[model samples]
Every structure is written in C-alpha cells, then in structure tokens.
Target: GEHLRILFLVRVEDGGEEDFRTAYEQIRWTVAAADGHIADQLCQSTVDPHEWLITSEWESAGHYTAWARHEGHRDLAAPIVATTSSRIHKPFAVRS
Candidate 1:
C-alpha cells in the first residue's frame, strides 16, 4: 500500500460562509479523532472569498480511503459537500 499526500480545494457556496465554518469546525474535531493523520492545514485564497485548501497526509492511500467512508463524516459532510470545487495535485516527500 502506498501512502499519499492529499490536497483538497474547498469552496463555500456563494451564500455559505456559515456552512463553510460549520463544516470546517466539524472536520477539525474529526481530524483530532483520527489515528494516522500526519498534518492538516487550512489555507484561504487571496483571490477568492469562498476558496480554501485543506492539506493532509495519511499513512497509506488505503487509510485515506477508509477515513473518507466513515459514517460520521459522511453524515456531517452531506450538506456541505456541494461547496467543494476541486482536487489538487499530490506532492510528496520521502521519509525513511
């Protein structure tokens, strides 16, 4: 199994600032609950009000896939998922 680095580009819908914050806060709590997450950073774009990026690392791609399917996350993110815009390229570092 190959470990992966993922960068998620998120956007709040035109009138969804509150949803954005809500979703992000929930995710923060969820991240803390996870076991193998390396790092999670949230960055806002200067050029777009509703745009942001979430960068994180997993022990393996399988780890990420499993986490994405977790029921609690699925339930909480259902309403806010439409705000996401893109999946960015992956860049990685080799750790020995």
Candidate 2:
C-alpha cells in the first residue's frame, strides 16, 4: 500500500504552548499504537513559537480515515484542538 501523509498547519493561541504540547504528548502513544500508523512528527516554527506543524503517515488513507472517524479521536484531541486554529493538507513528496 502507498503510504499516506496527513498534516496539520496550526497557529496556537497566546499562552497556549504548554497546554498544546502537553495535550500532544498525552495522545502520542495512543496514536503510535493505532492500526496502520506509520509515523508521526511535531515541529514548531523557529521564529514563531505559535506556529506548529503536525504530520502523520499511515499505511493507507482508509486507515487514517477510520481513526479520524472515531469519537475517541475528537475526545483525545480536544485539548490540543482547543488551543490552536488549524488547516490540513496532504501531498505526496519525497524526502532528500
């Protein structure tokens, strides 16, 4: 199966970094153990701590869709979601 990439481009609220990071940390393990979860990463903009990138790779788009459709997905991500505004984009690419 082709690996599927999903990404979140986020702008965090003032004073919300800790809560955002903590929330991300709390759910990291669960995400790792989920079916077809290939990999995950979190990155912060060097110049702007409020800007963040979250990326996740999966075995297939269906795998990610299944996970996202679950109520638990929203429940687990609520804290982090509340702390930031987000846009999602996924495009195929190769790494250097």
Candidate 3:
C-alpha cells in the first residue's frame, strides 16, 4: 500500500509559542492515538525561532482524510490554527 505524507509550515503569533506548542502537541497526540497513524515529527526552524514544521506519515490518503474530517480532529486543531500567524499544509504521495 502507498503511504501518504503531509507537511505543515506554521508560524505562531508573537508571544504565543507555548500556547501554540501545547495545542500542536495535542493535535499530534490525538492523531497518533488514531488507527491509521504511522508516525509524525515536529520541528522548529533553526533560522527562525517562531517557525515550525510538522510532518506526518499515514497508512494511506483515505485514512488521513478520515482522521482530518473528524470533528474531534477539528477541535484539536483549532487552537493551533488560531494562534498561527501563518499556516500552510501540503500533501504528498510518499516515494521510496
């Protein structure tokens, strides 16, 4: 089966690092607890302290979409989205 991956670029508002981190962590934890989650990683940019990136690997696109469409997922994601000054999400088909 082909795996799916997602990349998220996030930048939180000024003085909102801890709040953003907390919210992001919850989202990660929530997703990780779900059935189709493969693995995920979170990183902060070395060049820009306020910038962060999240990469998540899933069993398939369908599984990821199902998780994303859940109401609980939306609730868990709200705070992180609200606190971010900018956010970008992109999906990819994993290669190799």
Candidate 4:
C-alpha cells in the first residue's frame, strides 16, 4: 500500500518564526517516535516568509490520526499550537 502525506499550509505570526521553528523542530523528531511516522519537513514560503509548508509522511492515515488524538498531543505541541494561526483542510479549517 502507498504511504499517506499530510500537508499543512500555515501562516506564522509576525515575529513568531523563530518560536514557530523551534516548536516545529521540537515536534519533528518527537513526532517521529510514534508508530508509522516516516518523516516530516518544515518550510518557509519563498513568496512570503510568514507563510509555511509543513508536511509529514506516515505509513497510513490511521497512524497519523491516532497520534493526534493521543492525550499528550496538546501539551507536546503547546508552542506550535500557539505560534500559528489557522489550518486549512478539506471541508474544514481549524481557526486559531
């Protein structure tokens, strides 16, 4: 079966890039520890520094969902959840 890829298009608050990046870095490896987590990437948009492209590759959609629904998810990503604004996805948007 093919792998699953999640793409998060984000907008970092002004002056929050460093903090956002730090949070993302903290999450990058820690998130890798979960089952089926293959890899992740954090990127800044060339057109706008505040814009970002955060992608994570996983073995399956269930693997990613389970990790997100974990009890520790919030506390583990406290900084990241604070530094960003809105999350765009199909049929829904997680607004900050």
Candidate 5:
C-alpha cells in the first residue's frame, strides 16, 4: 500500500523568518518521535523567500490525523501559526 502525503504552504510574516524557521526546525525534530511519520522535508521558495513549503509522508490517514491532533504537535505548531501571514494544508493520496 502507498502512503498518504501532506503539503503545507506557508507565507511567513515580514521579519518573522528566523523565528518561523526555528519553530519549523523544532517541528521537524518533534515529528521524529511521532507515530506514522514516514518522512518530512522543508523547502523555501526561490521567487519569494518568505514563502515556505513543508512535505510530510504518513503510513495512513489515521496515522496522520493522530499526529495532527496531538497536543505536542499543536504546541510546536503554535509558533509557526502565529508567525505565518498565510498558510494552507493540502493532502494527497499516493496510488500505484
């Protein structure tokens, strides 16, 4: 079976880059301890430096949801959410 993937598109507030980056790096660390987390990556836009992208893979939707609803996850996300000027979460299904 294929895994489910999630994409987070974020636009950080002006002068909030460092704080946002730090928070996201902390999330990357936190996810390592999360269940169903296959892998994750963070990317920065070339055209707009303030825009960032996060991609995460999970074994299943349930697993992803579980992690998404975890308090620790929310705690780690608070900083990012506060610093984000705009954001979106997109989920995708991987099929053979």
Candidate 6:
C-alpha cells in the first residue's frame, strides 16, 4: 500500500481573509517541517480568497495523525477553526 492522501477544503469566515491567510501560512510552514509529507500542494482560490485547499500525500495514516495531533499545529489551527469551516476529505486516485 502507498501513502494516505488527504485534502483539506477550507472556507474562511466572511471578512476573515487576513486571519485566514495568516493561519493558513502557519499551517503550511508546519506541514513542511513534519515528516511523511511526500508531495504537498497548497492553492488559493482564484475566485475567492477565503477559500483554499491543501492536497497532501503522507507516508501513512500514522504520519498524518501525528501531525494532526501535534500541539503546535493544534494551536495554530484553533484560531482558524473559530473563524472558518473546514472539511477533511480522503480522496482516491482516479485510475484510467
């Protein structure tokens, strides 16, 4: 089996662009520091700055879980959670 792939779809609160951007940047940095990140992509929504997505490949579910449970990461995510809505999705690759 290969790594686990997760996609985080975030919708920031109205008028929360600055807060969202700042928090999201913190997360991006944290993710970069952690292990198990094989390939990661972060993108800003062209039509709506408040919307963003994080597509990442992890070495395993354990790796992803460790990062998710990190205190520092949780601290960074707390503020954003108060101001935005997020959906954590597990996606399967589309094979030909």
C-alpha RMSD of each candidate structure in angstroms: 3.5, 2.6, 1.4, 5.6, 1.6, 3.2
| Cα lDDT tens digits for candidate 1, 1-96 | 455777667666677677666666777777775766677777788997778777777777667667777776776554447556543546464355
Q: Rank the candidates by lDDT, best first.
A: 5, 3, 2, 4, 6, 1
- Each candidate structure's TM-score, on Cα atoms with residue i matched to residue i, is 0.66, 0.79, 0.88, 0.80, 0.86, 0.66
Worst 10-residue lDDT window, candidate 6: 87-96
Candidate 2 Cα misplacement greater than 4 A, ranges: 86-96
Better of 2 and 4 by lDDT: 2
Off by over 4 Å in 4: 89-96
Residue 30, model 1, lDDT: 74
lDDT of 3 by residue, 1-96 (tens): 689989989996679988887877788778767778999888999998888988889999999899888776667667778878889999998888
TM-score order, best first, reads 3, 5, 4, 2, 1, 6
> What TM-score would candidate 2 get against the native?
0.79
The whole-model C-alpha lDDT of candidate 2 against the native structure comes to: 0.77
- The lDDT per prediction is 0.67, 0.77, 0.84, 0.76, 0.84, 0.71
How many clashes does each candidate structure show, in the order listed?
0, 0, 0, 0, 0, 0
Query: Taking the tens digit of each residue's C-alpha lDDT, what string does model 5 give over 1-96?
Result: 568989899998688988888877878888787788899888999998888998999998888889888665677667778879888989988886
State the lDDT at 14 in candidate 2.
86
Report the C-alpha displacement of residue 44, candidate 6, in angstroms.
4.2
* Model 1: how far residue 3 lies from native, Å: 4.0
Report the Cα lDDT for candidate 3.
0.84
Winner by TM-score: 3
TM-score of 5: 0.86
What is residue 30's positional error in candidate 2, in angstroms? 2.4
Whichever of 1 and 4 has more lDDT, that candidate is 4
Clash pairs (backbone) in predicted model 4: none
TM-score of 1: 0.66
